[PDB]
């Protein structure tokens, strides 16, 4: 009885598969335990340690804070064998401790709560031990590599801190002085410390950017009337025009709005500052995507109307600059609306 349309289930294979995948990453970026089983249930990764390990190091859309929060768990064994698996496909041979830490820190954020930091460091240090045993041998107590890894982290934080005057920052001799007697009473060979200090000074240790990085650089461009949570991702950016009254015409350019669509939130802004190769946006209002519907319309004064509603009833009215931007934006907003609705899990 139902006619075939383009909205029939026979045509939504790709759309629904990709929707589930994005939901999986969304549950990981909120709670990595619920997220990870979600993706093995739907078969996005095998239930293997290296499987989850290959996934966390390569897939985009995963928060590096949330990856480190996961890989840094002592309780779960899988997290430890995924951690040992992630350190396995990182080769630290013919490299100083700081160049190994930098490579390791490129994938996992090494910050936050003392318990889980100690642990990624613990697991990192031993991978550094296995790989360059020789260097370990000129250490009275191999326990000192763990101590030295934290000293490098402490050096990096201090050196590139915006909160310390340059003259109150750690000098090379202050770094050497602080490590005196660290090796169970003996000192670490000084040229090794010269190297370390002399190369963190050349280049700060920085974690690789992720989706949270883009949301926070957008967030710093908005002057409020706090969106960089690890689950939130930027979907699209669009210029629209707001419509106070769709029954009268308006001059072109009036009520110009810059819209930011996130996977669970829609923020409406208006241009604030102007030149210098960018701008700020004065936050006007934001909308939850739950219960929201997009009704496309047009009249004699607005050929490309967009209307946002709910029945949980008109949120706002927009006119798009052209039909293409209209199709693209409404297609993304409808997909983000479906993502949020599907996500309302009732377990």
Swiss-Prot record:
Subcellular location(s) of the protein: Cytoplasm; Nucleus; Postsynaptic density; Cytoplasmic vesicle, Secretory vesicle, Synaptic vesicle
Coiled-coil blocks: 324-347
Positions of the PH domain: 255-342
Residues modified as Phosphoserine: 5, 8
Tissue: Expressed in brain, ovary, heart, lung, liver, kidney and leukocytes. Moderate expression was also detected in lung, skeletal muscle, placenta, small intestine, pancreas, spleen and testis.
Effect recorded for residue 113 to K: Abolishes guanosine nucleotide exchange factor activity
Ranges where the SEC7 domain occurs: 10-203
Record's function text: Guanine nucleotide exchange factor for ARF1 and ARF6. Guanine nucleotide exchange factor activity is enhanced by lipid binding. Accelerates GTP binding by ARFs of all three classes. Guanine nucleotide exchange protein for ARF6, mediating internalization of beta-1 integrin. Involved in neuronal development. In neurons, plays a role in the control of vesicle formation by endocytoc cargo. Upon long term depression, interacts with GRIA2 and mediates the activation of ARF6 to internalize synaptic AMPAR receptors.
Linked pathology: Intellectual developmental disorder with short stature and behavioral abnormalities: An autosomal recessive disorder with onset in infancy and characterized by intellectual disability, developmental delay, short stature, aphasia, and hypotonia. Additional features include seizures and behavioral abnormalities, such as inattention, hyperactivity and aggression.
Quaternary context: Interacts with ARF1 and ARF6. Interacts with GRIA2; the interaction is required for ARF6 activation.
Family: Belongs to the BRAG family.
Domain remarks: The PH domain mediates interaction with lipid membranes that contain phosphatidylinositol-4,5-bisphosphate, but does not bind membranes that lack phosphatidylinositol-4,5-bisphosphate.
Protein name per Swiss-Prot or TrEMBL: IQ motif and SEC7 domain-containing protein 1
Annotated organism of origin: Homo sapiens
Residues of the full protein shown: 512 to 871 of 963
